[PDB]
Amino acid sequence: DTMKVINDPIHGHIELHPLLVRIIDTPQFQRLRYIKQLGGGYYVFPGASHNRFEHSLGVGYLAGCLVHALGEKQPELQISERDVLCVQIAGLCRNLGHGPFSHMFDGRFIPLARPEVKWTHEQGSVMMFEHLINSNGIKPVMEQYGLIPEEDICFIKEQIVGPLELWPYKGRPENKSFLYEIVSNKRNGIDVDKWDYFARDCHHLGIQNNFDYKRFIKFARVCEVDNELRICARDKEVGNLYDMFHTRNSLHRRAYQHKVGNIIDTMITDAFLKADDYIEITGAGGKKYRISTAIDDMEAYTKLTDNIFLEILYSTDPKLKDAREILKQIEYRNLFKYVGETQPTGQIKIKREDYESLPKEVASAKPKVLLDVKLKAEDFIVDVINMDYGMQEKNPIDHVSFYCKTAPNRAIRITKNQVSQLLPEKFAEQLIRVYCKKVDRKSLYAARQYFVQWCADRNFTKPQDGDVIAPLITPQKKEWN
Amino acid sequence: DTMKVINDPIHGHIELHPLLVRIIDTPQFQRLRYIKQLGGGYYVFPGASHNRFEHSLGVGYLAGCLVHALGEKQPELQISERDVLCVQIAGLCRNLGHGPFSHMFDGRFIPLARPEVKWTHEQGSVMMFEHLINSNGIKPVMEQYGLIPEEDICFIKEQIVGPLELWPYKGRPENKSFLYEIVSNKRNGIDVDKWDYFARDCHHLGIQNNFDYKRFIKFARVCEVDNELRICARDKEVGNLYDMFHTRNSLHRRAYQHKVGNIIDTMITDAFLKADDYIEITGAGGKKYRISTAIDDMEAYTKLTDNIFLEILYSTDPKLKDAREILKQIEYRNLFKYVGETQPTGQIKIKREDYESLPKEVASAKPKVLLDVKLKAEDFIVDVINMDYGMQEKNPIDHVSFYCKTAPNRAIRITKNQVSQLLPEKFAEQLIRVYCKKVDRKSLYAARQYFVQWCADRNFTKPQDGDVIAPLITPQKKEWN
Amino acid sequence: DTMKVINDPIHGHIELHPLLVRIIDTPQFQRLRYIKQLGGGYYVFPGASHNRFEHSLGVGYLAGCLVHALGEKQPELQISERDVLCVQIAGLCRNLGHGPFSHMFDGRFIPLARPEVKWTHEQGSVMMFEHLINSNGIKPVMEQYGLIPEEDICFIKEQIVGPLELWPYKGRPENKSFLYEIVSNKRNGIDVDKWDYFARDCHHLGIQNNFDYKRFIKFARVCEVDNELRICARDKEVGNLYDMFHTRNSLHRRAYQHKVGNIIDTMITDAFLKADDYIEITGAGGKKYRISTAIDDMEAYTKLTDNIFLEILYSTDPKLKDAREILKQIEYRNLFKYVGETQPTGQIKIKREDYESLPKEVASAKPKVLLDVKLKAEDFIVDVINMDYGMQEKNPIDHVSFYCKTAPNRAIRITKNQVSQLLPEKFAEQLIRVYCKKVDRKSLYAARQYFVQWCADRNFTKPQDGDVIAPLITPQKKEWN
Amino acid sequence: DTMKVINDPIHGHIELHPLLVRIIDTPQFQRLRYIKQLGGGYYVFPGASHNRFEHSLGVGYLAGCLVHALGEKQPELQISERDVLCVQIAGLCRNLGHGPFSHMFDGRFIPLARPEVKWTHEQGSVMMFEHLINSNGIKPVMEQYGLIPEEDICFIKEQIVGPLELWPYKGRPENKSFLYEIVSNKRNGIDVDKWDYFARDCHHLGIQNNFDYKRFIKFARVCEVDNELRICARDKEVGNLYDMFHTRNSLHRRAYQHKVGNIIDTMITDAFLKADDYIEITGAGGKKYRISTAIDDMEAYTKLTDNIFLEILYSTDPKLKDAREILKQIEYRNLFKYVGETQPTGQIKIKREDYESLPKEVASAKPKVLLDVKLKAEDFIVDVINMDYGMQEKNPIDHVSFYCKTAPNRAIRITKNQVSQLLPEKFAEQLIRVYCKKVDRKSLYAARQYFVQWCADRNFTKPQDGDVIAPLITPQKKEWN
Ligand SMILES: Nc1ncnc2c1ncn2[C@H]1C[C@H](O)[C@@H](COP(=O)(O)OP(=O)(O)OP(=O)(O)O)O1
Ligand SMILES: Nc1ncnc2c1ncn2[C@H]1C[C@H](O)[C@@H](COP(=O)(O)OP(=O)(O)OP(=O)(O)O)O1
Ligand SMILES: Nc1ncnc2c1ncn2[C@H]1C[C@H](O)[C@@H](COP(=O)(O)OP(=O)(O)OP(=O)(O)O)O1
Ligand SMILES: Nc1ncnc2c1ncn2[C@H]1C[C@H](O)[C@@H](COP(=O)(O)OP(=O)(O)OP(=O)(O)O)O1
Ligand SMILES: [Mg+2]
Ligand SMILES: [Mg+2]
Ligand SMILES: [Mg+2]
Ligand SMILES: [Mg+2]
């Protein structure tokens, strides 16, 4: 029509369709300029200033790229301009539901603040998309470019959140099933969302990315699998897919789960919880919401961003003193002190309901040394991190379909033994990090003794620095010697 | 405390001395995390999310690099750990005085809001440095690492702003003159500050940087010039310096003075001006300041960042409706409309006192064409932009000293004719951009007719699109052919 | 056969059509793996190992990109798959005629070895393309993919060399004129060939490129200019084009005309000249050719690459001793010694026929100092380098057509004065570099005295290091001081 | 006479000491400009034009970096300028022994040509270093810069090849043990050689590198481990080291063992074997050597490079017809055809003595498919590729020492279970690739049936494409269904 050109550092010159421009140029979309992609990460990696907004353009752009590519290779798929635009729109909009500091909000804050509700960024994205549509008169614009809003909005939301609830989708039929594998791939997780963040986060973080999305796209084809058309990878490229999940895991270990970044996320959460009663956000009809209740009114949620942090930091209301103090502690780098890191053994798993009980456990361990300070449950933070290949215990590569040079229309499967013996044996594990809220040297030492003792007690793995931090405790455990 | 290692995307792994960590970990320094480097630029270049904070670490790092390098090549300079630390500190701190949206604040807002006061980021940086020092008990830490606060604080501020009041400096004597040429080079402008921003802005903007600071540093030496020790470049490398200023010009043309970015800056300024009476920021002793008066109290200025934008945007105060509306217009992409761009001719220059009178001039032109809509002065914005090589009319390369392979201690001068005939004739020009506040089709057409007529009237250059936008007006002027 | 995917460092994953694969997979094309892009450059820039082969794939790929892009925006152009393939083929093949060490061969060797012949890489490329086609049965394969060999081969050669010989081309008609502006743009020089080399050479050289080809392509349109369809740039993008030529100039100053690289090129040439009688290359019908006569037989030229250097280096024939010695001198880094660099003044220019007379002139200058050695003409090399914007004295931007946002189908012109006063006044100049073949310290000093005297004599510019290398000579000339 | 600066694309501006320049500027060193780093890799990865020469400068530069860094952190190590220079020299020179096409020579050609002798690049490097030293009068230059040639040359060779002769080294004593861990790390393989090639190969190959050597160096310290001084990593960084080996394995899978690159290596080897009797290279005293015997005379080996390929390709000697033909087949892309790829199962391993018997085994399998063509042993190539983490069956991280934030001088050990459950179970495996030398469609089909049958017979893993290429063979094996 008249394409708008945007210069992205990761993707270069992107073209945006007028319809996408209209969706972008709304308060609900522009809100994402005020939400850091990596949350507390930026307080550790000074390069990670980037916000969800730019990620969103990238995801939208990549969605478009993959759908166009599948189109050009296989006209028999009958992919229409209508289909392309919906995949683009879903890509653009699948981050609409992120809250202040991204993962912090949906990962730490809302679980603690509103444990009765179950909340996901996906649900938020659907709701906010709905709000964006209705507040900005998008439906006629969609119609103007040949979209059918009733069906297409369904399709778009399904891309975002999954089956709305044996074919479960209502936005498109089975012959178009592959379209659901682009923006948010519930089948195996190979989706353009990941591709943008691997590239963009790395560009910002200052750590370089091993994975080539352009290659993946060139080698992508659609084939029949059990009477559904699905996206297939080239057989010989399976190694690259294993690599992709490895890359995801690396970025977690190096950046997204960084020990200090996590604590900063935790401290911001603590502050928000303490501020929750006193901060007001005005939603629909002038009705007032809290940080924790903004998820209930999309008009209010529109105005909930990283700005909440500075609203607290700059406040003078005495009621907000407690929250303000925690943020000040963050500024002076008076952070909770990292004690150590350990893992469960065998397939012992620690469920979410047990998280609360863990600080108590550490405080209750009885190391056989004299300690100048005695510490209590409240003095300890235990952070449990699930590291997996995106499908709990399962190997996502078992959920990928492949094709061979010699027969491109014929989908096959490849098992782990068929690829390499050097690949992981398991695909999920847990990290336990322990910090101490008491910052002084005497407290830190004591915390370490409790911690290493607790590790021994529960038959967790030997802390890497165990012999150094707790020389008196490590000889007790036979396995460690 | 010992050395902190920080991963920067531009520079890789930087080391920060404990003393620099102490300066960084303060409200006054951390404040820079909340100020966008390129201001409104981010609303045009979605990559340009970066803030002054990260730039500052880079500038500090680069300052350290150059001073260390000079040290290792020339021990005769007697550069001490004390010297290095001060150059690092100056580098770290020469952005402390930046206001919300960087250049917008000191370039547009303060000139309009407080025309009586004369305000520079440099002055702000000195003041905020002072405030940082005094609020955080830095002086004993400086002493602990062998600095002499009285002299060294002087040295640091002099690096930031220039002579504080025949050798004019009091922080260091003549034999150390070259130290003043690293962080903020008043002699010719080749300084590490530029080097960081060229690299970092490019990384973010998605433009590619063609200038090599590491090469410059390798080839840098200190030589005696008229009984002062100054930083000299290798003769052969002069072409690279011409290139460096060209690069600066390119970044201005392409990014920093982008027509839409400038308008967004302008609209944000307008909003702030309209908000100025109602937004209140608490400074020292609970005393209240306005956006325009925060520069008077450093405690208040500490809390003045990009956050002001969102404070306005999210306000419900009826008094703030006007300002809030402008920001909403920015969000809906209802911007002032670009009319055109022109320049003066010959030696005609446009003085600062005449800026106000220019909208009136455009509205007063008599196009000799029938118009359905008539426009007024207030419907036009005229932005005058000075593009120069950093030294007004002068060629900064004439203020650089060089040395030869054959005699490394002997400074020479190189003239323009000695380098290339293909270099610029002049080193300063002006751009005049005109926008119209009336957005509709009929108004835009009219604005163009006035504008092109005005250009003709004043013997400005023919707008590039003159024949297209104003076909009736362009034939009048003979010079335009 | 379907698409072959090839992973290029600059361009990422390229697709090659089966027809292109067939052209590539021939001795005539694979020959380009054995010819360094930057010739002697690699002996200065250790990164510059790249060969013409890879450049060729890139130029082919970019040709395809531009033609496809024009196609997608403007179906009214009626661009066919046939057209695309021919543009691709031309792009792929316009380096086929390069000789050993690239520019060394066509720039230094053939002019000296065969002054009667006029030889260009373009002519060579046409000839070699013809040989490739005929030796490998390409014409039927072309037909198989819907090319019409008679017309299409003509089109391809015309793209490479210009009109083979008021519309001069026979491969396509006027309505398709813009196709001639892609691979080798005789009109203004903005062509994909440059785009690949800017990107690739920089990647290898370790110097970074300022210019964005992908942006150019996004903003490219075809418009009617004087009843021909031509490629037009967007008005506002003119600044970028001036930048492009500046970039070209920079790469010449920094890399392609580097003083040592040029001498190495010169020494290699000298060696080849001395080896010319004794090296034999077998051509068509078992007939034998020399380095200098291989351009006469394409079968022999096929076997003429950088390999001749090592054939000489490794030779034991006493007849080859002289040539072998020069190459050995290159290996021991016993190079001709750089004396200095100067330029003409005003409009005086130095014609190609006068190059020979210049060594004599330097040797004949009478500096008023006592010298222990006296030097002769043959001891001096004078290298004259033309640096220009690709169209001799002319400004190539005067040969570019533009379009405006408001009227995309309407081509306009933009003059220099309409863009910036900071742009170059002239577009062509000459560098004179002088080296001395006598390497010892006494000879070097003497050579400098002759040289600086000669500069004075001819009213050339003062060498940058004049006061250092020749302190006795420089005071004589009033203008210098 | 003084320091050379050289611009490397990977490392930027390197400084080279005069002594290093003298070593570089010799026929023995310059020879490495004519040996492709990745051998046949360039015929698959068009970017991989780079030669051993440039790699060598990088390895030398990085060696210098690590030794300097250890120096600056720990002056108590007593590292001298002498030590630095020797580590630089070893780094610079540990590729001197590479033959034409690098790994082709030492991996395929010499094993086949001279099975009686055991030959390594390391041994070649030592010999060539000796030859370089003696032919170029380096010993006096070494003395001039404060080296003691007898001791230092010993040290240098020991760095390259291991103990020349309870402390086994004679070049330095135990207190300097860590110096042996920089250039060629026999303990665990973490050496600067790898660091350069990861960076450089990636830069050229067009794959991005996910390992950060600069980070490693910043975190490196020397500690006492069992009364030897060793290079230790920070505890927290162990995950990065696991990543490093994973990256090495990826580069092997993706680039260094690429199926086509390996075949091209194999074809070049075949050609050389066929050329071996007729190519003559003149060594010391005019005595004549063959490709296979050049390793016996360093004077001859000096003149043995990639140039042998082109000597063959351009030859007219009828005796060389057979070798010439194979190279011509490479040019026409008439390569031996990839049949398939398989692995052993469980801990079954395939002995080196059995490699020769494997083609026979494939030819002897009796597939139940109807075939027009019967193939013989000589029609099949069976390539067994050992992929491991550089220490056979062993995990190199078990051979790394670590230190903790809290006690930097105290080395500890970290086991696999202490790091992650998602790490590899084994650290060595085998790939079996089969090609067929008969190129035609009918032969290829037959070869596949033999191959998949052979796989079944020997209880190898099911080829990835087994059910597609050999549908008639695959149902026989129960395990595969
Ligand atoms: N010269 C440049 N080089 C690189 N990127 C640029 C340049 N100019 C602008 N950009 C970036 C900024 C934006 O992300 C994107 C849009 O480009 P630009 O043509 O400036 O848009 P615009 O909307 O101001 O132009 P138009 O006048 O056609 O509306 O490209
Ligand atoms: N694995 C990694 N690779 C690259 N950059 C990293 C990695 N881990 C952290 N970084 C970045 C983030 C920070 O800017 C910087 C320092 O990281 P890190 O050494 O983990 O700090 P830290 O303060 O947590 O460690 P310590 O235990 O030494 O106090 O480097
Ligand atoms: N995993 C990889 N990642 C990046 N580039 C790769 C990878 N594998 C190969 N390449 C490069 C090498 C070549 O330039 C290009 C061709 O890819 P590749 O798939 O290896 O071709 P191929 O011809 O060997 O396979 P096939 O003929 O079986 O499809 O991509
Ligand atoms: N302007 C440049 N920018 C980047 N790299 C450059 C530039 N000029 C040269 N190089 C590269 C080429 C070589 O790798 C290295 C050495 O450059 P250069 O300074 O020209 O040495 P040189 O030996 O010719 O100078 P001199 O002999 O006068 O010291 O840097
Ligand atoms: Mg998802
Ligand atoms: Mg400045
Ligand atoms: Mg050209
Ligand atoms: Mg090794």
Author numbering:
A (entry chain B), B (entry chain C), C (entry chain A), D (entry chain D): 113 to 277, 284 to 599
Copy out sentences from the published article reporting this entry, exactly as the authors wrote them.
Sterile alpha motif and histidine-aspartate domain-containing protein 1 (SAMHD1) is a deoxynucleoside triphosphate (dNTP) triphosphohydrolase that cleaves physiological dNTPs into deoxyribonucleotides and inorganic triphosphate. SAMHD1 also inactivates the triphosphorylated forms of some anti-cancer nucleoside analogues. SAMHD1 mediates resistance to anti-cancer nucleoside analogues, including cytarabine, decitabine, and nelarabine that are commonly used for the treatment of leukaemia, through cleavage of their triphosphorylated forms. Tetramer formation depends on nucleoside triphosphate binding to the allosteric SAMHD1 sites 1 (A1) and A2.
